Amino acid sequence: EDPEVLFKNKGCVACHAIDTKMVGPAYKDVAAKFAGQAGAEAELAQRIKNGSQGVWGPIPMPPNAVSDDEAQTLAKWVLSQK
Ligand code: HEC
């Protein structure tokens, strides 16, 4: 299983992309930002289920989508992109 396949199996790519910006953060850009900053993961996945705060865009992402597992996976892919 891959988080890139799971990232496209839901609706992340609706505005994410693994290399472009639109509504949500570019996953690859997240890699080019955080890069070696793993101190959350729980509240990072909480963003995937409660909307962001506003770093690249002032429009938080649609909160709620799953539980807190299928997201936890795509939550470490962001922090762990390359
Ligand atoms: C558009 C309809 C989105 C969908 C569908 C998903 N995301 Fe998203 N995401 C979106 C926005 C508007 C934002 C915040 C705006 C800003 O630039 O800050 C985000 C951001 C994230 C983040 C955290 C980014 C951070 O600052 O490091 C993550 C980890 C994230 N989004 C996860 C994620 C996943 C896993 C999705 C599918 C399950 C997904 N997003 C969909 C917009 C949208």
In a nutshell, what does this entry contain?
With 82 residues, this protein is mainly alpha-helical.
> How many H/I helical runs?
4
Query: At the third CATH level, what is the topology name?
Result: Cytochrome Bc1 Complex, Chain D, domain 2
- What's the oligomerization state? monomer
- Which second-level CATH architecture applies? Orthogonal Bundle
* β-sheet strand percentage: under 5%
The largest β sheet comes out as: none
Total domain units:
1
CATH class membership: Mainly Alpha
Inertia-based shape = globular
What is the helix content? Answer: 25-40%
**Structural class designation:** mainly alpha
Order of helices and strands: HHHH
Q: Give the end-to-end Cα distance, rounded to a whole number of Å.
A: 17 Å
User: What is the assigned CATH homologous superfamily?
Assistant: Cytochrome c-like domain
Total beta-strand segments: 0
List the main descriptive attributes of the protein structure presented here.
82 residues; mainly alpha; Cytochrome Bc1 Complex, Chain D, domain 2; globular
Report on the architecture of this protein.
Helices cover 28% and strands 0% of the residues. It has 82 residues and is an all-alpha fold. The protein has one domain (1-82): Cytochrome Bc1 Complex, Chain D, domain 2, CATH 1.10.760. The chain is globular and about 25 Å long. Bound molecules: heme C. Heme C (HEC) is lined by residues 7, 10-12, 14-16, 23-25, 30, 44, 47-48, 52, 54-57, 59-62, 65, 71, 74-75, 78. The site of heme C (HEC) has 28 residues, from helix 4. One of its GO terms (cellular component) is periplasmic space. Electron donor for cytochrome cd1 in nitrite and nitrate respiration. One of its GO terms (molecular function) is electron transfer activity. It comes from Pseudomonas aeruginosa (strain ATCC 15692 / DSM 22644 / CIP 104116 / JCM 14847 / LMG 12228 / 1C / PRS 101 / PAO1).
